Amino acid sequence: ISGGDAIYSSTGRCSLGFNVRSGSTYYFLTAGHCTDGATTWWANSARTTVLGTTSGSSFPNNDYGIVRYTNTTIPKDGTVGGQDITSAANATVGMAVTRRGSTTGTHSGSVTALNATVNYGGGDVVYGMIRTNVCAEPGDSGGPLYSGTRAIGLTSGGSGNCSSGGTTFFQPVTEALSAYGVSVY
C-alpha cells in the first residue's frame, strides 16, 4: 500500500498520505479530519484487511493524523503510486506539484499561495495551509501532494472539482513529520 491508496475507517474512506517510520516502527500519515474519532483503519471496504490504529490526530487548527501499522505482512512502499519519495520539502509559490488520491487518481498544478486559512465551519478552522490550483474530490482527503521525489503536503480540502477545475488546500507535511518524530523513506 502506498501514498494515494484508499483507507477505510468505521466512518468513511480517505487516502493514505505517506508511509513514514521512526526506528523500526511504521506508520502512515493521513488527514487529521480523517483520524479524528477513528480508531482502526482497514485497506478495503469490506474491512477484512487491517492496517493499524490511530496514534495521533490534529484537527482542526492543523490537519494531520498518523496511524501505527499493526499489519505485519502488508507491503509498506515509500512511494506514491509507483513514484519514489526520498525527502520532504517546503512548498513555495510557483512550485509544480502533483496530488494523488483514492477517488480521482493523479492530478497536477501548482502552489498559488502559502499560509492560507480555511474555515470549514462550526469552529473547524485550519491555518497555515498551502493553496493550489489542483482539484480534489471526496475520498481524496489525506492523500499526498508531492513534487518529483519530494513530499510536500497532505490533502485537506477545497472547492470545485476535477471536471471543471478547482482549488485545493494541503497541510504542509514537514509540520507533521516534526510533530511525530517520523520521517519519509
Binding site: T11, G12, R13, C14, A31, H33, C34, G101, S102, T103, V118, N119, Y120, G121, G122, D124, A136, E137, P138, G139, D140, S141, T155, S156, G157, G158, S159, T167, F169
Partner: protein, 51 residues
C-alpha cells in the same frame, strides 16, 4: 442533514456519500449542501449512501 450553515467556501474531502434527488451521489455532506444552495433550494436528499 441540515444545510442551514451553507454555503461554505471549502469542504474537507472524506468520502461518506449521500444520494441526491438528481440521482447524483454527493461525496459528503459538505458537498451535498453546497449543491443544495447552488440549486437555490431545489435539490433534496433522496437517501443516505450512494445512489
Amino acid at each position: 442533514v441540515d444545510c442551514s450553515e451553507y454555503p461554505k467556501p471549502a469542504c474537507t474531502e472524506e468520502y461518506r456519500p449521500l444520494c441526491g434527488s438528481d440521482n447524483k451521489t454527493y461525496g459528503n455532506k459538505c458537498n451535498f449542501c453546497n449543491a443544495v444552495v447552488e440549486s437555490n433550494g431545489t435539490l433534496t436528499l433522496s437517501h443516505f449512501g450512494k445512489c
